[PDB]
């Protein structure tokens, strides 16, 4: 009836037994913080303990180092720094020695390394860590777990610490990340850890994306990963393409034409909602980037000089293959649920609106054919899609250029307000609402 014992009771179904174990652990953090942490790290560090215990130990440690409330988190980070340097040097030592000794997933240690580091790195307090983390991944003998859990830690560190505090280590890290991502890596799990790590390290690899030698390698590595048979790795890989596109638009010429287009397009068509979700996000991101450019460009028009960066109108160039997919995606309607849920359908529509405000006028002639063919369809889905799509293109094409179209639509737009389907009725309403509003 020790600590391992109290920890395991933190998952016991018995309500009384839980609040019990919980109270114990709370005072322990209050009246015995330094010791408590060294003990928990000792539990976590021992591969002889239950997954139940280790994970619990890890959760307690991580809980005394961070919170989602910036204020609380600040308070915890300070409390930790105020702890004896030798106690901390021991917790750090154990937490670290854990990496590569866990059989369960994810790693419960990486969450602790990321916890302590977020408090200690911004103060040059654990200057050894990164070198250690990088060596763990790049050692030619490192186990399949050594790389995976280390990459998860590197990943969490990048995710929660100011990227401003890693640019001076950006090359070391990136090497370790790209290392667990290259196809030669046997494990997709390591490949998965590596890919989510990269996703949070883009913020400070700007110096690396600038060197064409390296940007071509990163991009190839990411691309080969959108082809991974493990859906998770794919989605993670597509997630990078989406962020790379908003953080490095100016360098996408080389790949966009011969690679991205194909990948993202197919992704949008995937049967797997999470993958389709990424494809869409990617082209919404493009419209966004391209819209701010149209501004930055127009602003330089007044100042009679050229803008810093120029748009390449990738969005307008894909209008041909995007529109049909987006409209088709609006067919994947949610009969039953959450008008709060983010499914491909919700995505597509928001995307379309973006595509509209982007390829302003040239959006209508591509959307109409779908609206026409379906506005009067037996399937409530297609009937709603048509009414939906019409509601999306409303804001983009010239206010004047639209009015005539609104002329011929208005009739049917009203009928639908009396359509059986509550969904269609709701949609029709929204659409008609936008009309009366915008174009007086």
């Amino acid at each position: 009836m020790e600590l391992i014992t109290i920890l395991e009771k933190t998952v016991s179904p018995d309500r009384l037994e839980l609040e019990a174990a919980q109270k114990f652990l709370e005072r322990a953090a209050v009246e015995n913080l330094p010791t408590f942490l060294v003990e928990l790290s000792r539990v976590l560090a021992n591969p002889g303990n239950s997954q139940v215990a280790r994970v619990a130990a890890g959760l307690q440690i991580k809980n005394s180092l961070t919170s989602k409330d910036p204020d609380i988190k600040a308070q915890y980070q300070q409390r930790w720094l105020a702890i004896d340097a030798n106690a901390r040097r021991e917790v750090k030592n154990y937490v670290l020695h854990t990496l590569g000794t866990e059989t369960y997933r994810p790693s419960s240690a990486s969450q602790c390394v990321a916890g302590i580091a977020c408090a200690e790195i911004p103060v040059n307090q654990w200057p050894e860590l990164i070198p250690q983390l990088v060596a763990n991944v790049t050692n030619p003998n490192s186990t399949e777990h050594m790389k995976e859990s280390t990459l998860e830690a590197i990943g969490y560190i990048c995710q929660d610490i100011d990227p401003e505090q890693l640019q001076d280590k950006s090359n070391e890290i990136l090497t370790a990340i790209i290392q667990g991502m290259r196809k030669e890596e046997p494990s997709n799990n390591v490949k998965l850890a590596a890919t989510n790590a990269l996703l949070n390290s883009l913020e400070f690899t700007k110096a690396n994306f600038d060197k064409e030698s390296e940007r071509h390698f990163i991009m190839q590595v990411v691309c080969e990963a959108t082809q991974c048979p493990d859906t998770r790795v794919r989605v993670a890989a597509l997630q990078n393409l989406v962020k790379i596109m908003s953080l490095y638009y100016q360098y996408m010429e080389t790949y966009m034409g011969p690679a991205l287009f194909a990948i993202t397009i197919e992704a949008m068509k995937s049967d797997i909602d999470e993958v389709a979700l990424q494809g869409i996000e990617f082209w919404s991101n493009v419209c966004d980037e391209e819209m701010d450019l149209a501004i930055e460009a127009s602003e330089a028009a007044e100042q009679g000089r050229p803008p810093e960066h120029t748009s390449k109108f990738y969005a307008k160039g894909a209008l041909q293959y995007l529109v049909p997919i987006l409209t088709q995606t609006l067919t994947k309607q949610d009969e039953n649920d959450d008008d709060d849920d983010w499914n491909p359908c919700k995505a597509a529509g928001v995307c379309l609106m973006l595509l509209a405000t982007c390829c302003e006028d040239d959006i209508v002639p591509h959307v109409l054919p779908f609206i026409k063919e379906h506005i009067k369809n037996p399937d409530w889905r297609y009937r709603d899609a048509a009414v939906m799509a019409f509601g999306c293109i409303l804001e983009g094409p010239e206010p004047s250029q639209l009015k005539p179209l609104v002329i011929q639509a208005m009739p049917t737009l009203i009928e639908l307000m009396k359509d059986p389907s509550v969904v269609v009725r709701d949609t029709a309403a929204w659409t008609v609402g936008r009309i009366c509003e915008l174009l007086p």
Binding site: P34, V38, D84, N86, A87, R89, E90
Partner: peptide, 4 residues
């Protein structure tokens, strides 16, 4: 360490 933690102690002494």
């Amino acid at each position: 360490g933690l102690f002494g």
